[PDB]
């Protein structure tokens, strides 16, 4: 399950679609803990395709129902990032993750 609590600002009518590569300000939070992951600090802010499974299936749900500008919340289920497996060293298994994703793309 992905569920978005949208920080309004943006258009809500620019929807990425299939084969656009995306610009994300993304901030990962573990629930009941502190951060494992941000792309502020590298300031490189991740150039991804849409449609490839590159990221996991609950970063990329959630990013498909944001506009251009907008600022989401996401909270993605265990059973769709890592959690029966866990990532090693990282990411426990059986964990809930949240995101901070600002969506400020291109094409």
Known sequence: ???IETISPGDG???PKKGQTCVVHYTGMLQNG???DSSRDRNKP???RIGKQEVIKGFEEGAAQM???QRAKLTCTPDV???ATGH???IPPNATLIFDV???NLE
């Open 102 to 104: 600002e969506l400020l």
């Open 67 to 69: 506009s251009l500008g």
């Open 34 to 36: 502190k951060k494992f």
């Open 81 to 83: 990032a890592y959690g």
């Open 13 to 15: 009518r620019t929807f």
């Open 1 to 3: 399950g992905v569920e």
């Open 46 to 48: 991740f150039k991804f």
């Open 88 to 90: 090693p060293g990282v």
